[PDB]
């Protein structure tokens, strides 16, 4: 769960709580998770963060159902994204949308994950 006053500090903690490549000491403490696998997840939510402005919530609930498809599917492919949806409680937060203002809160929550990931290494 994530409120408006904490969802960035939640996402700041989740990147720190995510593991790093403790071996392979060539620019070490780098993540197993990569930037391009992370931007494939935000490419789902960023096209809903701007159709939340335009459209109703009553038309977006077909793709909001589809975000549980592909956040599961991207987690099944690579084990690094598998850890992201566990640490950042994404599959818990995605089942809790129910209106426009949480859809925009979750889609800003994914942007906070990308921001601190780019920040911390």
């Amino acid at each position: 769960i994530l409120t408006d006053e904490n969802y960035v500090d939640i996402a700041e903690k989740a990147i720190l709580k995510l593991e790093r490549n403790t071996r392979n000491r060539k620019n070490p403490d780098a993540f197993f998770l990569t930037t391009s696998k992370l931007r494939n997840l935000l490419s789902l939510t960023s096209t809903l963060f701007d159709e939340s402005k335009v459209k109703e919530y009553d038309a977006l609930l077909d793709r909001i159902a589809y975000l549980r498809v592909q956040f599961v599917y991207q987690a099944g492919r690579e084990i690094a994204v598998k850890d992201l949806i566990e640490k950042a409680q994404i599959l818990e937060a995605l089942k809790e949308i129910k209106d426009r203002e949480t859809l925009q809160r979750f889609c800003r929550y994914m942007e906070a994950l990308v921001a601190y990931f780019k920040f911390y290494g």
């Binding site: 006053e5 969802y7 960035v8 942007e111 906070a112 990308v114 921001a115 780019k118 920040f119």
Partner: protein
């Protein structure tokens, strides 16, 4: 201690419009607690004990030390910082942390330490969460764009 209020006005504006709003800033700076300067507007009401030693001589010196020893980060970089400094929700802390770290690698790799000793020193007074180190950074960037206006 004294108190002041400074107001910018355009050319050819009447002095009665000019002298009145300055008086509005003086009586606003009397009500900070008592000892304050009120730059340009009632919401830049800083203590003098952190306007000279922080804004006018410390932060404005370091901003001017950066933006003259480079040709890359122009006014557009400065202007997008002002929006980030002015709104300041919890989400703009992340968006600022992403915005500086993009440009840390976008620059040419000779002066990457100059930007990294700037951005980690700019992000330092963005997340202080006491408001006394952040509104100064906004007023320091107003006094820099006003000095480089073509």
């Amino acid at each position: 201690t004294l108190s002041a209020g400074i107001g910018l006005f355009a050319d050819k504006t009447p002095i009665s419009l000019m002298a009145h709003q300055t008086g509005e800033l003086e009586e606003a700076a009397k009500g900070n607690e008592k000892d304050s300067i009120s730059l340009f507007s009632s919401d830049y009401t800083f203590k003098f004990d952190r306007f000279i030693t922080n804004v006018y001589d410390d932060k404005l010196e370091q901003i001017r030390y950066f933006f003259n020893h480079q040709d890359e980060r122009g006014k557009n970089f400065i202007y997008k910082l002002i929006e980030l400094l002015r709104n300041h929700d919890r989400m703009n802390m992340a968006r600022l942390a992403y915005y500086l770290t993009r440009l840390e690698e976008l620059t040419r790799e000779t002066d990457r330490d100059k930007f990294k000793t700037f951005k980690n020193l700019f992000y330092s007074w963005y997340t202080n969460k006491n408001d006394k180190d952040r509104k100064e950074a906004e007023l320091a960037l107003l006094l820099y764009i006003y000095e480089i206006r073509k």
